[PDB]
Every structure is written in structure tokens, then in C-alpha cells.
Amino acid sequence: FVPVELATTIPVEIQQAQQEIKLFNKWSFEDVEVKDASLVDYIQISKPIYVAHTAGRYANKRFRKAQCPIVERLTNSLMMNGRNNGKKLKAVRIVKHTLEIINVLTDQNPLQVVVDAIINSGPREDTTRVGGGGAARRQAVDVSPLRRVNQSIALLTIGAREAAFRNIKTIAETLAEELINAAKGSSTSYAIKKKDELERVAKSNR
Amino acid sequence: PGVSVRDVPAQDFINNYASFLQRQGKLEVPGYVDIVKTSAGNELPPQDSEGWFYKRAASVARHIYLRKQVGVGKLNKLYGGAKNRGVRPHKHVDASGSINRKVLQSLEKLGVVEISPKGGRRISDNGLRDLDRIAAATLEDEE
Amino acid sequence: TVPSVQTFGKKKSATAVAHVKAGKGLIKVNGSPITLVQPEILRFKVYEPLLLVGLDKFANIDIRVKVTGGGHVSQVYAIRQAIAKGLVAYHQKFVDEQSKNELKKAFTSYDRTLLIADSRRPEPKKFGGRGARSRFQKSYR
Amino acid sequence: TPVTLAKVIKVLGRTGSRGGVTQVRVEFLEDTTRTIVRNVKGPVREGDILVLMESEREARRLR
Amino acid sequence: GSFQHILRLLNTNVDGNINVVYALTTIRGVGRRYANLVCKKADVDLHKRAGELTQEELERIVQIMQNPTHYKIPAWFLNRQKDVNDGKDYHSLANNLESKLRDDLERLKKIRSHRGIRHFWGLRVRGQHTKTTGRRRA
Amino acid sequence: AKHAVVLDQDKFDRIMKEAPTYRYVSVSVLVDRFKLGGSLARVALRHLENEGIIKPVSKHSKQAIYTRAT
RNA sequence: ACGGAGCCAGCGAGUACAACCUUGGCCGAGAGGUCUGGGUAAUCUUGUGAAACUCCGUCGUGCUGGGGAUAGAGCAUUGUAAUUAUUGCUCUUCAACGAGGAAUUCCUAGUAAGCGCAAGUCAUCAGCUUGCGUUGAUUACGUCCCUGCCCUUUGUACACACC
């Protein structure tokens, strides 16, 4: 509403976004409830930010990894392997292409599929290797709360990059499929299988 | 208004300039076209083949406009890039001198480049006209 | 005669100087307008000072920047810190404070440095190792 | 998969023979005022919620 | 479609489909930048698969392969130059080249030099340190 | 070589049959059916952008997403 | 990866009694030839417009256009001298290796790991070391389980002292 006139000429499509709605890139960042107690507060959609490439004074105190928006978590996780160490420009371009796939598939806000994928690839129980003499008996210890989020985002990118190792199906297509499978719990994607296969190990030693 | 070269994007500027030259075909050709490596380190020749030189000559002209006076050795260093020197780290060395020199020699006779004092090559009066006309043409393409 | 305050931002060695004036509404970067920049994906970052407070503020103020130092992406922060200060310097001197205070507290909620200069500079590489902390590989065989 | 709800009420130091385990007392959100001691692997803060399959059984210091 | 797959050229194999240059690289003599130089004279698309070609293009190319100085080559994109007493240059790009090198290697063995002595035993010729390199030998 | 790269006129009939009405259309999608492998799929997709048919979303080399024209 | 197009740093260094760094102009497909300078150095090389990167095209999952080792012929340069390829360049030769077994080293933020640049030795030779700036994570923010270090309390037939 009301395209403002300056000496420099900006397109109208950019000014359509301005003033009214504080959007992400084009579509809306608003809504997208988590609805899973444990991951509430740590997964943050309330922070509205446009571009996923900030300065970052995150890892300093202790619990400041929570402050970072979940779109920037996916960008940093793809940087593994020494060939791809650094270079967030390459990751940030790919993360835009993953979200464009989800917008096409059955409409939908793509962050609702991303947040639901984080819920459905976070283990409930992960055993710590206790000694007690020498042997590797595994006692059932519980998992909360950043450890459910930090493992889940890592397991998606491991399943994503391994699928596109010598393949035409380049990272953006595979990563989009992993989030749909986790959001719509299909028991096929390795984000779910690697989580489910640890469930499971705790109950045997209980 | 304020019709200048900087309103037009740098990558999109050369596309209108390349087609402008190929209509006339009066920028001149040296003789080394497509018998060429392009740089001192570059395995494959030019993929463009036809045209090619008109893309190069356009990008040389616009850089002579912005700066005071550009030379041959600096243009080779600017266009030139990385290598693969066996099983060692990748170095940087200059590009082809014979291609970039005959751009500057041929553009003098066409009516763009001028001989400057001290050292290098600055712009003529008629050279600024053709730069702005194509910039104005590219402004019409966008708007 | 015209109101001129020389604002400047800084991220690493990448420095930028925004000379503001009164007029029509120029926000140029190295001669070209705001919409170039040249990293191309990071064009959206340079709008962040504009789109938060609004384009209505820039209808009077005329800015132009010369950026040197650093790299490609580091220079975008230098421009963004310069334009953010460019408004505040104008609104502090020749405008009421309540407008300028609304700029301050707007940028706190979306604080990606903006007004504050960033802390991190590079640290020396000391002897015996491929870096500052990283040491060479040992062997006692 | 029986999902029992929970909530942190007290952090009990940093236990274990190794550094990678933390004891916690756990009160429930539904059916309040039922205190049980049980281990947590990751970071813990007052007011956090725990997800767990097996709830009523009790854990001890890991050796 | 599917017009011919092998498809010989001076006895050696030229596999169907693929490309102009990278099918021609199968010849024991032609490489990844010579076939582009040869294709430039005839003026054919590198975009095409090239195994499915017109009949005249094969025979036009073979004339350029045999004769270097006649067709448009600078005379310094050649494999071999200078042989016998005082005169001229020439090269080959077929089973001629592999046979030529064996005869040219015998010249080094006949004169009996530091290279020719090293070629007898199968050791490293170009001043390398043989305290590591190639733990197998031949 | 795992086949499906050689140019056949019989296949060019079936490309236009299976062109319209699809969610996913890209270089990533067509190779899964064992069609024109690799680069010839890009040339096949370049035909379908000329006379309408299928309209674009992304316009990058290596990331070329398209969607059907509603 | 292979093409164009876009195009940004900081540490340094540098001859007049020697032969140093050397823009600009012509010759050359390269390397390098030559005419000229300027600089005893925030003045000239130099903005040391360096790489990785950005963005459209060419190839696409085949030891392949990935990878570059072995090889042969000639064209350059530094030297009294390069055959025991000094060094670079030009076409050809086109292998080994589809993410590495027990083991094992370094590492808590502008760091790690990509990335080149400069100096040091230097008539001519970086796959090295010491320095600089670009690209910039994941993961602890605790513990004596392992490998060794400091004290106290205990035992000694040891005192060139558990070899």
C-alpha cells in the first residue's frame, strides 16, 4: 500500500512486503506453532528475521544456542566436510531452494514442515556407556532439551548429503524429501530410522 | 534525468554492447581468433567461439571509462586466474597478452580509446557517446 | 548550507563512509543505486535499515557511500552500519528526539549489530603450529 | 510408545564417574506433586520439560 | 538415428555416441585438445554426439590428421618434429604413432646413452629419487 | 554406462506425452525415470520452456525447478 | 570440474657502485624478448584491483570431460657449466584411487578447517618454515573411567635412589 517515491527507483514487489507484513523472503514467517513440550522456548519462531546470515555472538554463555532462529541452524549444519568448511553463501542459496520445493508441494508454510521434522527426529532415550567393571553395558538415561534439537538437525543433513553422493538429485531435493517424511511420519526417511533405532536400546536395559 | 553507466548492471551492460558491435562488424579482428587458449593456464579453449571477442572488447571499454588509464599488463592480471600446476598448490599468473593488446589497438581506430600522458590509455570524446547510447538502450530494455 | 554529517560504520577492516545531504532521496553505493550491491543474494540484507523504519524517512535524506577494505560479504555490513547511523545523525541534530529514539529501540529488536560496532578482530599466529591454537602433529615411535 | 509428561524441579549437581551425566528431580505436569529422581544427559534448567517413555522407575549415580 | 557404432578410423576404434573430441581421444595419438583443433578446421558442433555423422566429415578429418603443414595449423601443435639429418617436421595420429615411438626409442638404445641404459632396466629417467617412488617396478 | 543417454526418435514422441500435468519438473526428476541422462534432459527441459507448457520457479544452473502452467 | 561475465584484502619487501623491485609501449598462442621510465620508497612498482568466492552456460552419476603420475620431441630463461630432465612453457602419453583395517594426532570463537598472499634462504630453484588478511561451523561450558602431573597419610633391608 502506497509505493513511496524517492530519487532511486526500487521495484514495487519489494515495497509490497514493506510496512504491512514483516515477511521472511516472500512468504510469511508468522504462525507455525511447535506444540511439543520440551522443545518449547528452545525452538524459536517468535524472532522475526529476513536473511539467514547474521554476525552471531551465540556460543559464549551456555544456553545462547537457543536464541538462534531454526533457519540458521539448517544452514550451519550443511557446512561439514573439509571441502565445504566455511562458505555459508553456498549453503544459504541451497536452503532457499529447499523451501521453494515445500511451497509447491500441497501449498503450506514450509517452516511448519521444518519444525515438525525437528520433533519427529529427536530421540526420547539415549543410553550412556557406563563402566561398572569393564564391559560396555548401556544404562537408560533420558534426553532433554537442546540435545533433542541439536541431534535432530544433524541427522537430517547426514541423511541429506549421503543421498546426494554421486547423484543428479542434488542436496536441495533430498533435504526437502527428508522433512516431508518426518513431518508426515512415514517410517522411511533416515531422520526417523536413526532416531527410532535408539529408542529401543534403552528399554532392553531397563 | 541522470543517465549514467552505473544505473545499468555491469553483467547486463555487456550483453547490449556485444550485439551492437556484431551488427556493424567494424571493431576489427586480429587473426588469432579460435587459435587461442585465452590465458597462460586454461585447458579448454573458448566455448563461445563465435562472438567472444565482442564480449571481451566491451568489458575492456567500460573499465577504461571508470578509471583514469588502464594498460595491457594490468588487464592480463585482472582477467587471469587460477591454475593446476601438477601436484602442487594452485598459483596465479597473467592471461593472454596478444588478445588484450589488439583490443586496445583496434578500438583506437574505431573511435573509443585515446592515448594518455604518463602511461596507459584513457577515453576519447566520441567514445563516451557510444557508451552512453548503449547504456540508454539498456535503460529502455529494463524500463 | 545543506545539512551534512559524515557517518561511518565498520565490520573488520571493511570501512564505509556515508555522506548524507538534504534533497530528493539518493541511497547510492559506489555510484550505482541501492539495488546493485553485487553479492546479489545479500541485496536483501541492505534493505533491512530501510524496511524496518520505512521508506518515508529517506524522502528528504540523500546518502552516498564509498566502500573499501575487507572482502565482498564483509563490505555489506559496512554499508548497512553506515546507512543505519546515517538516519540517526540526521534525526539527532535537526529533528525531534522521539523519532530518533524510535529508531534506536526498533533496531534493538532486530539487532544484527547495526549501530553497535562488532568486537572481533584477528589474533596473531604464534610459532610451532598451523594456526594460533592448532599445533603440529607429534610422533614418539 | 507411552508418553509420560514431566518438569524439572531441582538440579542435583554434576554426577557420574565421567563428566557426561547430570542428576535431576522430576515433577509431573499432569498429576502434580509426584517427585522422582531420574538422570538427564544434556543441559538442564529450572522450568524445563522432559520427554520420557519410562517414568515411575528410579535412577542412581552411574559408575 | 543410431547410424553406426564403431566406425573405425585408421584401424583404431572410434566409439559411437559420446562426443566429437572424447570419442576421437580413443585413437592412440589424438587427445582432448587436438581433436578440438581438428574439428575447428572442418567446423562441426561439439554439442552433437558425433558418432552419427555425415560420410564426408570422416574423410576430411583423416586428411588433416596425416598432413600437418598443408592445412591450417601453426606447425607448433605437433607431436614430433625434426628427424634424420638437415630438414623438416612431421607427426602421426594412429597405430603409426605407437609404432614410431618404439622405433624412435631404439635410436636411443642404439646410440646407447644415459636414457637408453635406464630404459633397459626399467628405472626412473628424469633425475627422480628412487627411494620411495613406485614400489612394484616393471 | 547405464543406458538411456542415446538419442532416439521413438523417445521424443513419449516426452511430449508425459510433459504436461506434474508437480515436480527438473533435471533431478526426469533422470529418475531413466530418460535422457544428464545434460540431454536439460536440453529436453529447454524445449518445454519455449512455448509455455511448463513455467519456472528457480533460474540457477544446477538448481532448475519448474511447475506446471495453471 | 571446464567456459566466459562480475571483481574485493592485509602483513611485508625493494639498486648508485651497483645490477634490486620494475608499471606504460611494441614482439610473442606461451614462457619470455626488448625500447623507456619511476622509485633510496604512507610519493614509482602498488589500489602489490591475490585467491577461495559470486552468477549464467557446458558436463552429468561411466576410473568418466574427475585425477594427474610415468613418458618423447622441441621453443624459452639463469649461468664458466643444466647430459644424472635446474626452472617455466607447447601438443601428445593418459595410470594409481568409488571415502581408507587395527591404531592415532591436533582442537573450546574471528578460534577449527578451506583459501591464497608476502617475507626467510635466493645467480636460478616451495610440495618447507615464520608472518598476514578473506570464507567462518558443528560441540563441551563437565569429570577423574583411561594416560600422566601436585600434595597429604602410610610402609622400606633402597640413598650413583626400583633400569
- Asked if residues A66 and A44 have their Cβ atoms less than 8 Å apart, the reply is yes
Protein CA E76 to sugar C1' G71 (Å): 20
Q: Report whether E109 belongs to an annotated binding site.
A: no
Beta bridge partners of B95: B39
The rounded distance, in Å, linking the Cα atoms of B92 and B77 is 9
Sequence-ordered strand ranges (E) for E14-129: none
The rounded distance, in Å, linking the Cα atoms of E37 and A162 is 40
Q: Please tell me which residue of chain F has the smallest CA distance to E16.
A: F6
The DSSP string of A64-128 is: TTTTS-HHHHHHHHTT-STTSSS-HHHHHHHHHHHHHHHHHTTS--HHHHHHHHHHTTS-SB--E
Q: Do chains D and A touch (3 or more CB pairs under 8 A)?
A: yes
**How many beta carbons lie within 10 A of that of residue A185, not counting itself?**
13
Residue closest to A94 by CA, chosen among A74, A111, A110: A74
Distances (CA, A) of B36 to A76, B45, B106, E38, E59: 43, 6, 18, 14, 26
Eight-class DSSP state of A40: B
- Asked if residues B23 and E14 have their Cβ atoms less than 8 Å apart, the reply is no
B9 touches strand G (CB under 7 A): no
Q: At A82, which amino acid appears?
A: G
Eight-class DSSP state of B97: H
- Asked if residues A104 and F23 have their Cβ atoms less than 8 Å apart, the reply is yes
The rounded distance, in Å, linking the Cα atoms of C8 and C68 is 12
The rounded distance, in Å, linking the Cα atoms of B122 and B110 is 15
Grid coordinates in use for E18?
Answer: 559420446
- Asked if residues A150 and A189 have their Cβ atoms less than 8 Å apart, the reply is no
Grid coordinates in use for C75?
Answer: 563490505
* CA of D10 vs chain A CAs: smallest distance (Å): 15
Report the CATH number that the domain containing residue C62 is assigned in CATH: 3.30.230.10
Do E113 and E137 fall into the same domain?
yes
- Asked if residues A88 and D3 have their Cβ atoms less than 8 Å apart, the reply is no
**How many beta carbons lie within 10 A of that of residue C82, not counting itself?**
25
* CA of E60 vs chain B CAs: smallest distance (Å): 19
Handedness of CA A152, A158, A164, A170 (dihedral sign): positive
E76: alpha, beta or left, given left = phi > 0 and alpha = psi -120 to 50? alpha
Q: For cell 524496518, what's the residue?
A: C52
E104: alpha, beta or left, given left = phi > 0 and alpha = psi -120 to 50? alpha
Which chains neighbour E (Cβ–Cβ under 8 Å, 3 or more pairs)?
B, F
Burial class (CB in 10 A: 0-12, 13-18, 19+), C20: buried
First to last CA, chain C: 78
- Asked if residues C73 and C42 have their Cβ atoms less than 8 Å apart, the reply is yes
Q: At F17, which amino acid appears?
A: K
Do E5 and E66 fall into the same domain?
yes
Chain C residues with beta carbon closer than 8 angstroms to that of B4: 31
Residue ranges making up the domain that contains D26: 1-63
- Tell if the CB–CB gap between C54 and A19 is shorter than 8 Å: yes
**How many beta carbons lie within 10 A of that of residue C128, not counting itself?**
6
Report the CATH number that the domain containing residue E4 is assigned in CATH: 1.10.8.50
Residue closest to C86 by CA, chosen among C34, C130, C121, C124: C34
Q: B142: helix, coil or strand?
A: helix
- Domain termination site, one of E74, E102, E124: E74
Beta bridge partners of C6: C19
- Experimental technique, in short, is cryo-EM
**How many beta carbons lie within 10 A of that of residue A88, not counting itself?**
16
The rounded distance, in Å, linking the Cα atoms of C128 and E126 is 36
Strand G: list positions under 7 Å from protein Cβ. Answer: 1-10, 23-32, 37, 46-47, 49-74, 83-86, 88-94, 98-99, 105-117, 126-127, 129-145
- Tell if the CB–CB gap between C73 and A89 is shorter than 8 Å: yes
Name the closest nucleotide to A153, judged by C1' and CA.
G138
User: In sequence order, what are the residues at sequence separation of 6 or more whose Cβ sits closer than 8 angstroms to the Cβ of residue A92?
Assistant: A51, A52, A53, A75, C41
The experimental resolution of this structure, in angstroms, equals 3.6
Burial A21-50 (b: 16+ CB within 10 A, else e): ebbbeeeebeebebebbbbebbbebeeebb
User: In sequence order, what are the residues at sequence separation of 6 or more whose Cβ sits closer than 8 angstroms to the Cβ of residue A136?
Assistant: A129
What's the total number of domains in chain C? Answer: 1
The rounded distance, in Å, linking the Cα atoms of B99 and B59 is 13
Residue closest to B123 by CA, chosen among B57, B74, B62, B77: B62
Angle between helices E55-66 and E34-42 (to 10 degrees): 120
Do E10 and E20 fall into the same domain?
yes
Beta bridge partners of D26: D8, D36
In chain A, where are the structural domains located? Answer: 1-206
Q: Give the pairing of strands F66-68 and C14-19.
A: unpaired
The rounded distance, in Å, linking the Cα atoms of B58 and E69 is 35
- Asked if residues F53 and F69 have their Cβ atoms less than 8 Å apart, the reply is yes
Name the closest nucleotide to A81, judged by C1' and CA.
G113
Name the closest nucleotide to B81, judged by C1' and CA.
G51
Decide if F12 touches E, using CB distance below 8 A.
no
Handedness of CA F53, F58, F61, F66 (dihedral sign): negative
B55 touches strand G (CB under 7 A): yes
**How many beta carbons lie within 10 A of that of residue C119, not counting itself?**
8
Q: Please tell me which residue of chain C has the smallest CA distance to B11.
A: C38
Q: B140: helix, coil or strand?
A: helix
- Asked if residues F21 and F48 have their Cβ atoms less than 8 Å apart, the reply is no
The CB-side HSE value for C47 (13 A sphere, CA atoms) comes to 23
Name the closest nucleotide to A64, judged by C1' and CA.
G141
In chain B, where are the structural domains located? Answer: 1-143
Which H or E run contains C68? strand C61-68
Report the CATH number that the domain containing residue D60 is assigned in CATH: 2.40.50.140
A136 touches strand G (CB under 7 A): no
The rounded distance, in Å, linking the Cα atoms of D12 and D44 is 10
The rounded distance, in Å, linking the Cα atoms of C61 and C32 is 17
- What residue has its CA nearest to the C1' of G29? B36
Protein CA A133 to sugar C1' G152 (Å): 29
Protein CA D17 to sugar C1' G159 (Å): 40
Name the closest nucleotide to E81, judged by C1' and CA.
G73
**How many beta carbons lie within 10 A of that of residue B82, not counting itself?**
12
The rounded distance, in Å, linking the Cα atoms of C72 and C41 is 12
The rounded distance, in Å, linking the Cα atoms of B54 and B19 is 8
B129 touches strand G (CB under 7 A): no
Decide if A101 touches F, using CB distance below 8 A.
yes
Q: Please tell me which residue of chain E has the smallest CA distance to B46.
A: E36
Q: Please tell me which residue of chain C has the smallest CA distance to B3.
A: C32
Beta bridge partners of A138: A129
The rounded distance, in Å, linking the Cα atoms of E130 and A141 is 58
Q: At C136, which amino acid appears?
A: F
Q: Give the pairing of strands C61-68 and C21-22.
A: antiparallel
The rounded distance, in Å, linking the Cα atoms of F53 and C65 is 45
- Asked if residues C118 and A55 have their Cβ atoms less than 8 Å apart, the reply is yes
Q: How far is CA A142 from the centre of its chain?
A: 22
The beta-carbon contacts of B134-143 under 8 Å, at least 24 apart in sequence, are B134/B13, B134/B16, B134/B17, B134/B20, B135/B3, B135/B4, B135/B5, B135/B7, B135/B8, B135/B13, B136/B3, B137/B16, B137/B20, B138/B8, B138/B12, B138/B13, B138/B16, B139/B3, B139/B7, B139/B8, B141/B16, B142/B8
Chain E residues with beta carbon closer than 8 angstroms to that of F7: 1, 49, 52
Residue ranges making up the domain that contains E84: 75-138
Which H or E run contains A1? none
Q: C104: helix, coil or strand?
A: helix
Q: φ, ψ for residue E110 (rounded to 5)? A: -70, -50
- Asked if residues A66 and A148 have their Cβ atoms less than 8 Å apart, the reply is no
- Tell if the CB–CB gap between C54 and A17 is shorter than 8 Å: no
- Asked if residues B72 and B97 have their Cβ atoms less than 8 Å apart, the reply is yes
The top-level CATH class assigned to F1-70 is: mainly alpha
What's the total number of domains in chain D? Answer: 1
CATH topology of domain A1-206: Ribosomal Protein S7 (1.10.455)
Protein CA D25 to sugar C1' G149 (Å): 37
Q: φ, ψ for residue E70 (rounded to 5)? A: -70, -55
Handedness of CA B60, B66, B69, B71 (dihedral sign): negative
The CB-side HSE value for A108 (13 A sphere, CA atoms) comes to 17
Q: Report whether B63 belongs to an annotated binding site.
A: no
Residue ranges making up the domain that contains C92: 1-141
- Asked if residues F4 and F36 have their Cβ atoms less than 8 Å apart, the reply is yes
Do E138 and E93 fall into the same domain?
yes
Protein CA E21 to sugar C1' G88 (Å): 28
The rounded distance, in Å, linking the Cα atoms of D56 and D35 is 10
Angle between helices A110-119 and A70-77 (to 10 degrees): 70
Do E60 and E88 fall into the same domain?
no
- Asked if residues D45 and A63 have their Cβ atoms less than 8 Å apart, the reply is yes
